[PDB]
Swiss-Prot record, chain A:
Taxonomic lineage from the root: Archaea, Methanobacteriati, Methanobacteriota, Thermococci, Thermococcales
Presence of keyword Ribosomal protein: yes
Subunit-level organization: Part of the 50S ribosomal subunit.
Sorted UniProt keywords: Ribonucleoprotein, Ribosomal protein
Family matches, as HAMAP family: Ribosomal_eL33
GO biological process: translation
Coiled-coil segments: none
Source species of the chain: Pyrococcus furiosus (strain ATCC 43587 / DSM 3638 / JCM 8422 / Vc1)
UniProt keyword annotation of Cytoplasm present: no
Cellular component GO terms, alphabetical: ribonucleoprotein complex; ribosome
Protein name as catalogued: Large ribosomal subunit protein eL33
Molecular-function annotations in GO: structural constituent of ribosome
Swiss-Prot record, chain B:
Gene Ontology MF terms: rRNA binding; structural constituent of ribosome
One GO CC term, this protein: cytosolic large ribosomal subunit
Protein name as annotated: Large ribosomal subunit protein uL22
Family assignment from sequence similarity: Belongs to the universal ribosomal protein uL22 family.
Residue ranges the record marks as coiled coil: none
Keyword vocabulary terms for this entry: Ribonucleoprotein, Ribosomal protein, RNA-binding, rRNA-binding
Keyword RNA-binding annotated: yes
Physiological role: This protein binds specifically to 23S rRNA. It makes multiple contacts with different domains of the 23S rRNA in the assembled 50S subunit and ribosome. The globular domain of the protein is located near the polypeptide exit tunnel on the outside of the subunit, while an extended beta-hairpin is found that lines the wall of the exit tunnel in the center of the 70S ribosome.
Swiss-Prot record, chain C:
Pfam families reported in the protein's UniProt record: Ribosomal_L13 (PF00572)
Listed name of the protein: Large ribosomal subunit protein uL13
InterPro entries: Ribosomal_uL13, Ribosomal_uL13_bac-type, Ribosomal_uL13_CS, Ribosomal_uL13_euk/arc, Ribosomal_uL13_sf
Keyword Ribosomal protein: yes
UniProt organism field: Pyrococcus furiosus (strain ATCC 43587 / DSM 3638 / JCM 8422 / Vc1)
Curated annotation (Swiss-Prot), chain D:
Entries under Pfam families matching the protein: Ribosomal_L3
Family: Belongs to the universal ribosomal protein uL3 family.
Organism: Pyrococcus furiosus (strain ATCC 43587 / DSM 3638 / JCM 8422 / Vc1)
Function noted in UniProt: One of the primary rRNA binding proteins, it binds directly near the 3'-end of the 23S rRNA, where it nucleates assembly of the 50S subunit.
GO-annotated cellular components: cytosolic large ribosomal subunit
Record-given protein name: Large ribosomal subunit protein uL3
Length: 86, 151, 142, 364
RNA sequence: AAUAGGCGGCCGUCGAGGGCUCGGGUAGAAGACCCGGU
RNA sequence: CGGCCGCCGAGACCCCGGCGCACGGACCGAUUGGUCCGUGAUCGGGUAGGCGGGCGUGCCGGUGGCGUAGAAGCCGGGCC
RNA sequence: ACCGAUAGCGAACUAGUACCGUGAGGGAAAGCUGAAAAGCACCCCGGGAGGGGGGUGAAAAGAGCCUGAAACCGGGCGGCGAUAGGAGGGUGCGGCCCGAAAGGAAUGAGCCUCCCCGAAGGAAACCGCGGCGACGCGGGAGUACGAGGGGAGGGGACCGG
């Protein structure tokens, strides 16, 4: 089970997509290492204890970031928060 | 006006009174009721006596334009609505009597609900310059109160 | 928390990474703010900072740009310039920053980090002026 | 520009607000080598005039001239505290302070009113009128132990400065009972010597004669007289509007141009006038008296108090200073004096001048 | 002064310290401020 | 300044499901209507303006009904 | 097949009335208790107006009287609330709160676990080679994954709003 940080939404300069989030896992710093996490689940724990579940589907950039698709989008208070992979 | 805005009135433990079409300021009535809310009946009566005697200002929180402050902490705008105090004191005496008649100890009566409303307006006119007649009206006030014997 | 020794680091290249970290959610403390360097000409750098200090609101001085003149405040404002200062997220990020000059008595014996991407060894020539000299010219305490 | 004139009033004294405290504060201190307390406090008594042989440089040197003087009464100060300052990140910080324990008061002017004996005052009873929460069960042993700790810190070297906390004694002159507490810096270049000076003077009385030198310059700090709300004509000295003006004459004409679309902070306006914190520099100390008397030629001594007493003030009974000129404040105001922080290159000699006449006629 | 400060003392986990009320102005448009109160 | 190598980025382009429209075809309903199938890369923004269908209100001729075991009206809420 | 009290004649009523202008002349507003007044007897308080008990009535519908909306004002309740900037809204979700009915649901909700197919699209580990370099090429492989479409088990009250 891996640990990660929420970076931002998938976005253009002025356009935002609320169903996809950029995640930076702790000790993954390349496409080669990030590609091993595709298909795994990502869990975000709400302050009240509710769990929001997404899945890793693609790698983002080349510095080890990944893209996560959430059926229920994160609330935006999760920006800079810490998520748990599997 | 006859009805009260209290929901769960209990005739066994509570007493109520009201006054209608009072010719006082509804704004100052609201301000005085805000302060009287939640106090014991004796404390409220002494409060009104002090206000009438000018020994104790009533703070203003909603209608306080161009009002000077008063000595001491918490002031802030304040004034002395003598007429409102007198009318509300009469209403409080009436509710005290109602409770006593029902058989409730007057020393344990707490003002659980007190409210003021704007009633009918009596229209009038005053003459002004350039042949213009202008409104000159009186705004009446309704007062409702219900007290409970606490334990 | 992470402590950075700003001795011999480019001001802008240090501030960029520090602001990125503050956004990512790390506590950052810059310990040697006065020893950061700014590349260019001494006279033009001093003139630019003097003009920044001279900026003010004509109608009321109590509202005009309070641009800094101390070393620590200069570094703090340089970092603040690279954050969404008008957003709650940016304000929270900026609140996670502390900047000091010299190593205070509470930070001795700790591991002082360094920014490799902002070291002065990159520069072809050492034609730079220190934030301490800039503050001294402006008339700050230190 | 067509016609040009200097601005009305000074922007260097803004905001023109009421003083923060009626007790004046001193932000800066003179740099001196002599180990002495830098300043003194007193109460304004009044004004008179003298005739003396001038000694400072000028055309009127060696000639008899008229000079007004302000007499301010200065009962001795009680040195009751010592405070130590270390260096902080942004400035000086208070490391610690220590005050002497309660002692009997031997200068309270008690009168045997019928019934009950004399009250038998003591310190910490006049002081509670100002502090209101003083140490309980405070003893000489713990006081000495605290003083020793302070000295130990001084030896270690974390103390960069030391100051003396003193209190006035209005009850001596029967002006009032509530004292006033201040702290004064000490001259010298060694914190240990300054601390030893303060320690030697702890709990004792200090007089003007032991600190100030006759004939030297001083700076006077006080709170000016209150005038209340005043219009711009009196507050900033603007010009009256033309006599044909039908919307008033004692007001500013235009309060700004179209752009900027706001009223600038530099436009004269009405507001508080007087009761401001002010400092006047280079006031000469003419003479220091004792017990309400002034010694002129070692053979005749005259009572400074004019016939009928000072207007709005009582009779001078304690030590007093005769300052040359005017000082800010009202009668009975607390006024502080410090050695001149900015004296001229050429200054009068440090000694009492030759006084030929002192005005003691009725001033009311 | 959002890094929203330092220090000595007093109290709390009945109670220090205050406000109104009283006699007056070193003050004052209301507030505020200062001295006195056996 | 002369070139190169990765990545990010639209309602554009590709794919899946759904709606309507245009044209042609087969069925049922006693007036303008209904169901289904086929083709559309060569259909789907829109001001002035042109055309088609539908929603809602008062009264009349018919038809089928509801209501003091509670009509119209009014405040809040569920579903299409 | 006219309107239904701002409509219909200006006037559903003490209406060509009240009222405006010296005059010729101009000209409103305003319908409804209940089947029956049975229109509140008596008691406490208040100077009185009224208030509170207690009665009448299927229902106060209480004469300020059928129904009683909106704007506005007072109180109670749920959420926010004194370092924060945009025409007061849009997309997505997270706190706190309400959730009987009309929506789904013990003939089983949120949720957890397991198996199969899968469009457009689509990695990496590992190994060999090319380029000064960022990197790329061939095998891995059209594999892992993928919108959506199906099946099985566990738990037992929430999902929609």
């Amino acid at each position: 089970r891996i640990k990660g940080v929420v970076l931002s939404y998938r976005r253009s300069k002025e356009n935002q997509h609320n169903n996809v989030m950029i995640i930076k896992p702790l000790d993954v710093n390349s496409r080669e290492e990030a590609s091993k996490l595709i298909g795994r689940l990502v869990l975000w724990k709400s302050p009240s204890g509710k769990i929001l579940k997404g899945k890793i589907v693609r790698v983002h950039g080349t510095k080890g970031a990944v893209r996560a698709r959430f059926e229920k989008g994160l609330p935006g208070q999760a920006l800079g928060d810490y998520v748990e992979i599997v | 006006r006859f009805g009260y805005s209290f929901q769960n009135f209990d005739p066994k433990r509570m007493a109520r009174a009201s006054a209608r079409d009072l010719r006082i300021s509804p704004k100052l009535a609201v301000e005085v009721c805000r302060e009287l809310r939640g106090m014991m009946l004796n404390d409220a009566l002494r409060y009104l006596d002090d206000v009438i005697a000018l020994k104790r200002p009533v703070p203003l929180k909603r209608y306080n334009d161009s009002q000077g402050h008063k000595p001491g902490k918490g002031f802030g705008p304040g004034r002395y609505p003598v007429k409102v105090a007198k009318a509300i004191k009469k209403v409080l005496l009436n509710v005290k009597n109602n409770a006593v008649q029902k058989g409730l100890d007057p020393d344990k009566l707490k003002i659980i609900h007190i409210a003021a409303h704007k009633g009918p307006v009596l229209r009038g006119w005053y003459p002004r310059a350039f042949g213009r007649a202008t409104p000159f009206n009186e705004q009446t006030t309704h007062i409702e109160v219900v007290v409970e014997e606490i334990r | 928390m992470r402590i950075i020794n700003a001795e011999g680091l480019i001001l802008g290249r240090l501030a960029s990474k520090v602001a990125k970290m503050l956004l990512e959610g790390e506590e950052v403390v810059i310990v040697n703010a006065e020893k950061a360097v700014i590349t260019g000409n001494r006279d033009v750098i001093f003139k630019k900072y003097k003009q920044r200090t001279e900026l003010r609101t004509l109608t009321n001085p109590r509202r005009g740009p309070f641009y800094p003149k101390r070393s620590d405040e200069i570094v703090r404002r340089t970092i603040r310039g690279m954050l969404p200062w008008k957003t709650d997220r940016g304000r929270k990020a900026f609140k996670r920053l502390k900047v000091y000059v010299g190593i205070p008595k509470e930070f001795q014996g700790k591991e002082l980090e360094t920014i490799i991407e902002a070291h002065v060894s990159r520069l072809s020539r050492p034609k730079y002026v220190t934030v301490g000299e800039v503050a001294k010219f402006l008339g700050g305490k230190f | 520009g067509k016609v040009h004139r200097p601005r009305r009033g000074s922007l260097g004294f803004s905001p023109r607000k009421r003083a923060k405290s009626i007790v004046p504060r001193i932000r800066s201190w003179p740099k001196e080598t002599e180990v002495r307390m830098l300043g003194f406090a007193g109460y304004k008594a009044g004004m008179t005039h003298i005739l003396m042989i001038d000694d400072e440089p000028g055309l009127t040197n060696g000639k008899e001239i008229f000079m007004p003087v302000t007499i301010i009464e200065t009962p001795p100060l009680r040195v009751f505290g010592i405070r130590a300052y270390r260096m902080g990140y942004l400035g000086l910080e208070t490391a610690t302070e220590v005050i002497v324990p309660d002692f009997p008061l031997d200068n309270y002017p008690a009168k045997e009113r019928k019934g009950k004996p004399k009250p038998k005052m003591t310190f910490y009873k006049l002081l509670e009128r100002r502090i209101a929460t003083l140490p309980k069960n405070y003893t000489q042993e713990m006081f000495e132990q605290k003083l020793g700790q302070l000295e130990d810190m001084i030896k270690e070297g974390e103390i960069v400065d030391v100051r003396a906390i003193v209190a006035t004694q209005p009850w001596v002159i029967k002006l009032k009972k509530k004292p006033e507490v201040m702290e004064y810096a000490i001259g010298g270049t060694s914190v240990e010597e300054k601390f030893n000076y303060i320690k030697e003077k702890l709990g004792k009385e200090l007089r003007v004669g032991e600190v100030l030198k006759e004939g030297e310059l001083l700076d006077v700090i006080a709170v000016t007289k209150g005038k209340g709300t005043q219009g711009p004509v009196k507050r900033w000295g603007i010009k009256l509007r033309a006599h044909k003006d039908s919307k008033g004459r004692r007001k500013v004409g235009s309060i700004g141009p179209w752009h900027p679309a706001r009223v600038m902070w530099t436009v004269p306006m009405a507001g508080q006038m007087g009761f401001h914190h002010r400092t006047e520099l280079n006031k000469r100390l003419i003479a220091i008296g004792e017990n309400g008397k002034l010694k002129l030629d070692e053979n005749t001594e005259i009572e400074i108090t004019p016939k009928g007493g000072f207007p709005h003030y009582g009779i001078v009974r304690s030590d007093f200073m005769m300052i040359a000129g005017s000082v800010p404040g009202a009668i009975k105001r607390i006024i502080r004096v410090r050695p001149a922080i900015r004296p001229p290159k050429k200054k009068p000699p440090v000694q009492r001048p030759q006084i030929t006449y002192v005005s003691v006629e009725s001033k009311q």
